[PDB]
Amino acid sequence: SALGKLQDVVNQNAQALNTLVKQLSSNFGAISSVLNDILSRLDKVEAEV
């Protein structure tokens, strides 16, 4: 805990990248968060939307 300023600067960059990667799992209002799954459930214009 003496090195707290350096370890915090590591932990924030790890936290930011794990958050950036975890956001790939989110739907954002789409039918599924898996991109090849959308392309399987729907035909072209519906999949595109």
């Binding site: 035909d43 072209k44 214009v45 595109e48």
Partner: protein, 49 residues
């Protein structure tokens, strides 16, 4: 462009469609700029037998 189809198949004549007419007879592009104009011709194209 001009052709005859059964009245049910008019829904395959649209951009980005699939089904045997759109698949094997008349494929429209997805970025079609244009109009699809259709009418019944039972009194003209149908025949006895």
């Amino acid at each position: 462009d001009s052709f005859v189809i059964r009245g049910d198949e008019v829904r395959q004549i649209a951009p980005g469609q699939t089904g045997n007419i759109a698949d094997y007879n008349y494929k429209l592009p997805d970025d079609f700029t244009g109009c699809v104009i259709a009418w019944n011709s039972n009194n003209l194209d149908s025949k006895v037998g």
